[PDB]
Amino acid sequence: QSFLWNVFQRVDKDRSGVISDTELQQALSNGTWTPFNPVTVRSIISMFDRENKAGVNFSEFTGVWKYITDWQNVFRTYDRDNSGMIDKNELKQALSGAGYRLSDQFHDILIRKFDRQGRGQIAFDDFIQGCIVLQRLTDIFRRYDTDQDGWIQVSYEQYLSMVFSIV
Amino acid sequence: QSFLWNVFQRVDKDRSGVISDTELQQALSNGTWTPFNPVTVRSIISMFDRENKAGVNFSEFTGVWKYITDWQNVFRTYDRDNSGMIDKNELKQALSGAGYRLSDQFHDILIRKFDRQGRGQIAFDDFIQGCIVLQRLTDIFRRYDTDQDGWIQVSYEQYLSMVFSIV
Ligand SMILES: [Zn+2]
Ligand SMILES: [Zn+2]
Ligand SMILES: [Zn+2]
Ligand SMILES: [Zn+2]
Ligand SMILES: [Zn+2]
Ligand SMILES: [Zn+2]
């Protein structure tokens, strides 16, 4: 699509043909007038950078745009008060949606862990990072939960291996 | 001691009265002609920074110097070929020293995880970071190993809590 090319051209400010980490950061809003989470940008870029330039070309940027737009849909679906910030109540709705069974008190930990703003509400950039991290911890857990009952038994050495495979 | 003050003055290059992250990095050698591990410096400084300036004053720097010198002793004690780099064989000696019972194959993972050089040998700056991380993972594990048999049983929610308490 040619519309994607206009976005690419606007984001690719040095006109190198490759959008770097700083450039994608500048083209993204988190609705709080602070710079979009550098770690989130780092995650998104390395997720679509097939070569290793620390950036994306147009061919890969189409995947990046797909990815970011998908998150905007999901964020807004679970943004019911339309506050532009997912609250404790809504974060539960989001996770409960995807089949997570977690105690109310544990959502306090998730919010304190991902919210770079103090407000106890999660912005779009932090929300993406949060879910990416959560997905990875679930995938790892499932390797060790061989009977699918939400419990694992691990030795000290198996535990270290588990923690190190997070990267 | 006045000798510590001469070191402080030489390290504190902007003469601010506080040694920052960049300044401590420059005053430290890892014996490989690459910059001392920024994460290691970050760990050491935040370990002795009682206030929050992202640096250390003379009162705290004495603790920093104590800490770094302690690591130099330990590093050299386990540096038997005097290579200036702890090898797989020596890393086992180091860990076995402090009572760790880990398989030979798992030391491959530790080395691949901490060695920023490719050589499969751990430099001084990476060695400090490695052990700090290992100590923290052991402390956390011990909270969940209530009967002290080197095994833990945890639910998915307990697992997430465990991972998040690493920080
Ligand atoms: Zn560019
Ligand atoms: Zn909302
Ligand atoms: Zn089971
Ligand atoms: Zn200074
Ligand atoms: Zn050696
Ligand atoms: Zn037991």
Residue numbers in the entry:
A (entry chain A), B (entry chain A): 25 to 191
Give verbatim excerpts from the published study on this entry.
ALG-2 (apoptosis-linked gene 2) is a 22-kDa protein of 191 amino acid residues containing five serially repetitive EF-hand-type helix-loop-helix Ca2+-binding motifs (EF1 to EF5) and it belongs to the penta-EF-hand (PEF) family, including the calpain small subunit, sorcin, grancalcin and peflin in mammals. ALG-2 (a gene product of PDCD6) belongs to the penta-EF-hand (PEF) protein family and Ca2+-dependently interacts with various intracellular proteins including mammalian Alix, an adaptor protein in the ESCRT system. X-ray crystal structures of various PEF proteins including ALG-2 have common features: the presence of eight α-helices and dimer formation via paired EF5s that are positioned in anti-parallel orientation. Binding of Ca2+ (or Zn2+) to EF3 enables the side chain of R125, present in the loop connecting EF3 and EF4, to move enough to make a primary hydrophobic pocket (Pocket 1) accessible to the critical PPYP motif found in Alix.
